[PDB]
Design an enzyme around this catalytic site. Structure first.
Site, short mmCIF file in Angstrom:
data_model
loop_
_atom_site.label_atom_id
_atom_site.label_comp_id
_atom_site.label_asym_id
_atom_site.label_seq_id
_atom_site.Cartn_x
_atom_site.Cartn_y
_atom_site.Cartn_z
N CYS A 44 7.93 -5.56 10.24
CA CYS A 44 7.14 -4.55 10.93
C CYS A 44 6.54 -5.01 12.26
CB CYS A 44 6.02 -4.04 10.01
SG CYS A 44 5.45 -5.23 8.78
N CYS A 57 4.87 -9.36 11.53
CA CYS A 57 4.47 -9.69 10.17
C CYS A 57 5.45 -10.62 9.46
CB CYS A 57 4.29 -8.41 9.35
SG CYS A 57 4.58 -6.88 10.28
N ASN A 96 -0.27 -1.77 11.29
CA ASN A 96 1.15 -1.75 10.98
C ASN A 96 1.55 -0.54 10.13
OD1 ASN A 96 -0.02 -2.93 8.51
ND2 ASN A 96 2.12 -3.32 7.95
N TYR A 129 -4.43 4.18 2.88
CA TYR A 129 -3.02 4.49 2.71
C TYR A 129 -2.81 5.77 1.91
CZ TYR A 129 1.72 2.75 3.46
OH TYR A 129 3.00 2.56 3.92
N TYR A 130 -1.55 6.05 1.62
CA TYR A 130 -1.13 7.31 0.99
C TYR A 130 -2.23 8.06 0.26
CZ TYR A 130 3.95 6.61 1.73
OH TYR A 130 5.21 6.48 2.26
N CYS A 178 2.46 -0.56 7.10
CA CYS A 178 1.75 -0.75 5.84
C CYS A 178 0.31 -0.28 6.01
CB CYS A 178 1.79 -2.21 5.41
SG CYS A 178 2.82 -2.54 3.96
N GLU A 216 -1.87 -2.40 6.45
CA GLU A 216 -2.55 -3.55 5.90
C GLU A 216 -2.96 -4.55 6.98
OE1 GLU A 216 0.89 -3.77 4.11
OE2 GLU A 216 1.80 -5.37 5.32
#
Ligand code: DTP
Ligand code: DTP
Ligand code: DTP
Lengths: 732, 152
Positions: free
Chosen positions: A220, A457, A432, A725-726, A434, A436
């Site tokens: 990423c 990453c 990123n 996230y999601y 992610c 994260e």
């Protein structure tokens, strides 16, 4: 008629089939030979290839993978490994390490540097460390993941050239091929055994690259686009080059001026963000069949931006294609101020980045300074702006976040106040794919701009379920931080900016897997919050040993060139900038000498700017039959779609911990989950990929109230959470 | 368009004739002094009496601070990621000047073509083409208006 590998025809000897299955059944309970032999409904027909026999038996055994019978996981996993071992060497027994590496290099599959870096003698010696019997400890779900991607193979014909174990030892050899011959073997065996026994997890790109002519290993990227035609042209040409390597893109366009903004004085007016954004989308999907698949990215921007309302709906299915950029994910950056305007029921002002000086910078560097400038510009009448009720705006965000589930949140203030970097020199203004990672960046004025910086990453994750006590993290922390930092010097850098950052701060993103299995083992859960303290102690060890491992490398090879820009060099530790409210949910005291570490690092620095970040691990965890990262398992047996068929994987040791686990939908709410995530942030250098779960079945009329969507978002921030996230919404 | 004016307020600053003589002056301001004014009057009278036609970008530029005068462009993209990245960043810079683009991608290999030997297969032309489209419309309301090009 029966078809053999060599093609020689022969009659059917069913006993042969039976024995094979019998062998794989040894030591397993609740597994029936008949089931598979009947489940398979194998359809014999004159002249049938024996290999099709494997495919058939393996598949059959797979469909039997259930909670009531978890051993089918290994039974089938072993039947596959067999076919794989037999389909590559012509027999189960693997060839000598030396012969192997040799044959491979001849086929141009392995990097020729292996034969040059190592001697025939050393190879035969490493061959002894190899324990080919560990291939039977794999779960079926893990085996499939390997065969499809992990193993070196011919994508066209379908031929497989290597086995699991060879992959392990080789990845280690190439990663530590530069170490002195005094310990070069020592680290080779110590690393191999670690990864092979599932003690340490590695990113897919690594497991399927090091030791092969390829040099692309970065999954990423985080690019920052400035407010320029030149800038954009670069940021675009960049994502293209990277996505071709199948690497996710995190775009940060928040600098691009808003619609209507005056260009070149008064010779032209801005066209808008949408036009450019789309261009970024076509770039991300520049290398996908039909643009349908591959190419994933998450674009970020401030919440007070002028075009916030138009950007907020971009992912909506229903609207004009002219105002939509659906494929890309997004991340709305929010801060303390925005959350306050909501609580007091006040409004919010939208500004164009190019109309309010020092507003963007302060937005990440100084929250106080941000407030000063913000308020000022509000009264300024000459400044272009637009008022919006905090209640309405946030609702829009939560709405799109629910409708799509791809609209992420990122609290900027938390990514600069409690971070390893100095928000003044190198502030975090993006994430990123992610979501994260949290690393600084610098916009490029061109593709070869030397003054630009791109975050890359090179992740990994530990297996909480592979260790016995926290002290085992010392060795692990060394094998991880060492091999990783080494990769940085093994891979290539197509773009200058990407290289600058890698060599400048040498960052790393280390996470964890099988966390669910971990908590369960110690008889803990998510919701109730009975794992609050344990979480504090466990992480406190994961981060410490990692900070002591990087420091050890700094004393042996020198710290990162830009260590001066980090707060770690100024004597500031994560335990000093963590959200104060975190003490109202945890009393677990520090179990490690963080004072003795405060010195060893203060004098020798760290080889890596940031080590610990929490990221999601789908592929990784599977190979270790572990639970995805910190996220709790939805069900005992999960299912997925592969090119070979349906995949099933049961939660580790379901046979004894079935009543210890706490399935995702068994949680009454998100309270507990947030607290645990908040506790983790206190140690994690970078951020965590936390999802927001919701069950309509638990709400009146089956409709999630907006009063609860905000109520939780506020709690997340209150505990130092960095990113969201999601947003999964279960479908009964 | 052609007359100098304030796009915001709506104020017009010049007249037709002044536009003619000025465009000529700046175009022949380097000629020797003896042959300078001779060409200035001979050119002015030509365009003013509609004897000679000039492109919109010229009539509405020479004599102002602007330096962008090229209406249309022809770019040739090779078969590479680098090539494309360039051909894209180019059209962008040009379309911002409201100049039409003639793209020639015919070099880009076709779908299924082997890349780097056998380490990957071509994704297709469509993916890249679209990118070119977003570039052409990089500076347009919505994306609907402005940015015109013809790919071959
Ligand atoms: N001639 C046969 N008669 C009956 N079953 C067969 C025959 N050939 C293959 N099979 C079945 C049994 C096993 O499940 C599988 C055999 O494949 P496999 O044992 O791996 O290789 P192979 O068939 O060439 O012989 P070998 O056991 O030496 O490897 O298919
Ligand atoms: N003709 C145009 N139509 C639409 N957008 C444009 C146009 N020209 C430039 N832009 C956009 C693209 C970039 O977002 C940004 C350009 O920034 P930039 O190239 O630095 O302008 P500039 O060089 O004239 O100086 P400045 O940054 O002060 O405006 O505005
Ligand atoms: N992963 C990919 N998927 C689809 N198309 C790709 C991919 N990578 C590159 N391409 C396309 C776009 C470019 O026009 C071209 C290759 O560009 P380039 O990076 O220069 O490859 P290359 O020069 O190293 O090898 P080659 O000469 O075979 O193209 O093929």
């Amino acid at each position: 008629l029966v078809t053999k590998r060599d093609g020689s025809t022969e009659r059917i000897n069913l006993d042969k089939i039976h024995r094979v299955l019998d062998w794989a059944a040894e030591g397993l309970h609740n597994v029936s030979i008949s089931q598979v032999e009947l489940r398979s409904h194998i359809q014999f027909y004159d002249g049938i290839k024996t290999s099709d026999i494997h495919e058939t038996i393996i598949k059959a055994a797979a469909d039997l993978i259930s909670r009531d019978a978890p051993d089918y996981q290994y039974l089938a996993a072993r039947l596959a490994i067999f076919h794989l071992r037999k389909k590559a060497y012509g027999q189960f027994e693997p060839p000598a390490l030396y012969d192997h590496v040799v044959k491979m290099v001849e086929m141009g599959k392995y990097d020729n540097h292996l034969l040059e870096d190592y001697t025939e003698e050393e190879f035969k010696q490493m061959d002894t460390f190899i324990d080919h019997d560990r291939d039977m400890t794999f779960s079926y779900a893990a085996v499939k993941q390997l065969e499809g991607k992990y193993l070196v193979q011919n994508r066209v014909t379908g031929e497989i050239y290597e086995s699991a174990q060879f992959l392990y030892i080789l990845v280690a050899a190439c990663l530590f091929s530069n170490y002195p011959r005094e310990t070069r073997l020592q680290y080779v065996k110590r690393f191999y055994d670690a990864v092979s026994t599932f003690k340490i997890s590695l990113p897919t790109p690594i497991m399927s690259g090091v030791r092969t002519p390829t040099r692309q290993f970065s999954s990423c990227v985080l690019i920052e686009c400035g407010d320029s035609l030149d800038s954009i042209n670069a940021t675009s040409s960049a994502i293209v080059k990277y996505v071709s390597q199948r690497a996710g893109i995190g775009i940060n366009a928040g600098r691009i001026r808003a619609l209507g903004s005056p260009i070149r004085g008064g010779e032209a007016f801005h066209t808008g963000c949408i036009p450019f954004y789309k261009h970024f989308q076509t770039a991300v999907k520049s290398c996908s069949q039909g643009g349908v698949r591959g190419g994933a990215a998450t674009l970020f921007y401030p919440m007070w931006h002028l075009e916030v309302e138009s950007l907020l709906v971009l992912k909506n299915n229903r609207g004009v294609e002219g105002n939509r950029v659906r494929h890309m994910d997004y991340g709305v950056q929010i801060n303390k101020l925005m959350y306050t305007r909501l609580l007091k029921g006040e409004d919010i002002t939208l500004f164009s980045p190019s109309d309010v000086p020092g507003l963007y910078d302060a937005f990440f560097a100084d929250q106080e300074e941000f407030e000063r400038l913000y308020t000022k510009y509000e009264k300024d009448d000459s400044i272009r702006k637009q008022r919006v009720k905090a209640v309405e705006l946030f609702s829009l965000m939560m709405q799109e976040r629910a409708s799509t589930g791809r609209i992420y949140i990122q609290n900027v203030d938390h990514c600069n106040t409690h971070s390893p970097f100095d928000p003044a020199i190198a502030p975090v203004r993006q994430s990123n794919l992610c979501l994260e990672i949290a690393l600084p960046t610098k916009p490029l004025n061109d593709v070869n701009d030397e003054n630009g910086e791109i975050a890359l990453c090179t992740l990994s994750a530990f297996n909480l379920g592979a260790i016995n006590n926290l002290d085992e993290l010392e060795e692990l922390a060394i094998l991880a931080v060492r091999a990783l930092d080494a990769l940085l010097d093994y891979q290539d850098y197509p773009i200058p900016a990407a290289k600058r950052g890698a060599m400048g701060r040498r960052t790393l993103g280390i996470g964890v897997i099988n966390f669910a299995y971990y908590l369960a083992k110690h008889g803990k859960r998510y919701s109730d919050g009975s794992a609050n303290n344990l979480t504090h102690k466990t992480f406190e060890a994961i981060q410490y040993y990692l900070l002591k491992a990087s420091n050890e490398l700094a004393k042996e090879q020198g710290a990162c060139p830009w260590f001066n820009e980090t707060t770690y060099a100024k004597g500031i530790l994560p335990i000093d900038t963590y959200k104060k409210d975190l003490d109202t949910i945890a009393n677990e005291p520090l179990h490690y000498d963080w004072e003795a570490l405060r010195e060893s690092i203060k004098t020798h620095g760290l080889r890596n700017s940031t080590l610990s970040a929490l990221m999601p691990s789908e592929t990784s965890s599977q190979i270790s039959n572990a639970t995805n990262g910190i996220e709790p398992p939805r069900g005992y047996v999960s299912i997925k779609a592969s090119k070979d068929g349906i995949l099933r994987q049961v939660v580790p040791d379901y046979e004894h911990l079935h009543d210890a686990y706490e399935l995702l939908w068994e949680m009454p709410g998100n309270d507990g989950y947030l607290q645990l995530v908040g506790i983790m942030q206190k140690f994690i250098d970078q951020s965590i990929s936390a999802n927001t779960n919701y069950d309509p079945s638990r709400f009146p009329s089956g409709k999630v109230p907006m009063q609860q969507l905000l109520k939780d978002l506020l709690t997340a921030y209150k505990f130092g959470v960095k990113t969201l996230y999601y947003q999964n919404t279960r479908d009964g």
